Write a protein that binds this ligand. Structure first.
Ligand code: HEM
Ligand code: HEM
Ligand code: HEM
Ligand code: HEM
Lengths: 146, 143, 143, 146
């Protein structure tokens, strides 16, 4: 992908003062609630039976933070995201067995969460750049599935 | 898939809080659809100004949420309720049904942006279902 | 979307021609789903060998096609007909419904490969609509 | 993408041997029948009113041939498909207003036509490579929509 300076700056700007402990849990919880099959992977995470339980689940919250911090390496390496995610793709495929369609779905939840959080700051061009960034990351994370 | 009573009453409730801003939701969600997913622009070539907030985007956005409003009134049977709009989409504009999901996602992003506190995960799942049901209803007459 | 009477008699007549090979269609379609779209392998990691024509692949292809057979018999009401199978996909295996479309495409490719004369575009349009109804029926219990 | 020598040989083999005057029309006619919205672009192509009219339509047939030959440059240089299809993508976007989602569905119909044509010779590995090739081409064709 060819990035414009505006795109690189928007992406840096979203992450520079991101509250990961806010946004991360919101994104993953929302995903588990709106697309409940994504709970497949979280049998070891305890109570997921209702929305309230998922939103109060500190183990899922800690995972939301972990997944969100997982975008950090893309932000830092925007021209080399394929290479930066190759090992994480291997992991999600060979060890974790996560259906990569779920990456797309989580990104859509993350978008909704960041939209809610940023308000007026979530301009049309912000959405455009952030969508472009998520598409590249999600593709990257699907590459090593075989 | 089929809307439960829970989904129908969740959508009706959310619609009671947000319906006052239907025109603004539509304008914003269509301008976002066009910008963020420029493949969708291919159906709007007769109205070249597709910039956010433009006259044509506002008017077309208002039309779409009018259909969403009607879909809320006809929520118990969207297949019948949206049949005339399905006929129009199938044979006049001939919009590939794939695009309905793109616009639905953009509506959800706007509703979250405008109504962050009301747009809970619980509201979101039921609204997402409702928009999938809308999309399916609109695809009915295509083939 | 709703299957017309034409779609239902089209699917039944085609099923009458291909049903005798249900086991071989299922094996080949599953093996092609796994290999051509390895995203789907994520639901099958319990199996030693996912390669085309392997024991588990044949065994499961046969099960799936039995599901498709049931669907043809329950074609007037796929929602009720596949309710138990939806429940199973929803809560046990929790297959992302996006995978249903993929297998549907693989089944159509295997039908065209095995039955090239019978699989006209007219047969194809109705079977495609039928497998989409199947997919929707399977998704019913997910949320 | 990362091609294997086997994928290169298969893709080259499919197009070397192909009767374009047969496969071209069948793939395009099937797409207009199975996905009737794709008819919107062919208002100057005469009778599209029945599956029979479409399969018997010479102008649709000539077009199917032309589209299929449109894969030739990609088969010839599998390493530069984005670049090669630049101008074609611009044509489909700005002049023809073709929804790029239709490229994917024409690709699916083409696969059905080739499978029906090759029978047992359409091996699983043949389908893996063909799909990988259509995915690259469909991506390249959608690249210049802005
Ligand atoms: C935005 C997309 C995602 C990113 C960037 C991401 C990133 C990460 C990272 C960095 C780790 C820890 C890796 C390590 O231990 O070295 C992880 C683990 C994991 N992720 Fe993903 N993830 C994403 C989406 C998902 C989704 C959608 C699911 C399933 C719904 C999921 C399920 C898991 C699971 C089950 C683990 C392992 C927990 C453990 O045993 O340590 N991830 N992810
Ligand atoms: C939530 C899904 C949608 C709904 C409820 C919807 C509803 C409507 C309605 C009510 C109209 C006006 C019909 C009239 O003149 O009476 C309309 C027009 C139109 N829609 Fe859809 N629409 C949807 C999705 C889409 C999508 C995804 C596209 C293309 C990407 C699209 C393209 C168009 C176009 C080109 C017009 C005609 C513009 C004009 O003649 O002024 N629609 N829609
Ligand atoms: C046409 C769509 C499908 C139909 C009709 C279908 C049908 C069936 C049936 C009848 C069973 C066995 C139920 C029983 O044991 O009583 C089954 C099991 C199963 N299916 Fe589905 N299926 C479909 C799609 C899929 C897809 C897309 C996937 C995954 C990518 C999938 C994954 C599974 C798995 C993991 C099992 C359990 C198999 C085992 O480990 O023994 N199915 N399916
Ligand atoms: C494999 C995907 C496709 C390829 C490789 C392809 C290739 C081509 C080529 C080579 C041309 C002629 C360009 C020229 O003369 O400079 C063309 C024109 C055209 N294509 Fe595509 N095409 C594809 C898919 C489609 C689809 C799916 C549609 C719509 C259903 C479509 C609609 C058209 C139209 C309407 C023309 C103009 C014909 C005319 O002038 O009347 N194409 N395409």
């Amino acid at each position: 992908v060819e990035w414009t300076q505006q795109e690189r700056s928007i992406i840096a700007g979203i992450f520079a003062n991101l509250n990961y402990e806010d946004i991360g849990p919101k994104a993953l919880a929302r995903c588990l609630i709106v697309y409940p099959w994504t709970q497949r992977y979280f049998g070891a995470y305890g109570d997921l039976s209702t929305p309230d339980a998922i939103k109060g689940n500190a183990k899922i919250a800690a995972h939301g933070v972990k997944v969100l911090h997982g975008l950090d390496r893309a932000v830092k390496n925007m021209d080399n995201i394929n290479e930066a995610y190759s090992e994480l793709s291997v992991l999600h495929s060979d060890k974790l067995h996560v259906d990569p369609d779920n990456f797309r779905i989580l990104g859509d939840c993350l978008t909704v969460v960041i939209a809610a959080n940023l308000g007026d700051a979530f301009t049309v061009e912000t959405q455009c750049a952030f969508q472009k960034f998520l598409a590249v990351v999600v593709f990257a994370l699907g590459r090593k599935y075989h | 898939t089929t809307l439960s009573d829970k989904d129908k009453s969740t959508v009706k409730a959310l619609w009671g809080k947000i319906s006052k801003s239907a025109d603004a939701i539509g304008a914003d969600a269509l301008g976002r659809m066009l910008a963020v997913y420029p493949q969708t622009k291919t159906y709007f070539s007769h109205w070249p100004d597709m910039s956010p907030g433009s006259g044509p985007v506002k008017a077309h956005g208002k039309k779409v949420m009018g259909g969403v409003a009607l879909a809320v009134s006809k929520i118990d049977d969207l297949t019948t309720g949206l049949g005339d709009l399905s006929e129009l989409h199938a044979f006049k504009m001939r919009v590939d049904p794939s695009n309905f999901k793109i616009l639905s996602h953009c509506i959800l992003v706007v509703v979250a942006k405008m109504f962050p506190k009301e747009f809970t995960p619980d509201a979101h799942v039921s609204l997402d279902k409702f928009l999938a049901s809308v999309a399916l209803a609109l695809a009915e007459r295509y083939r």
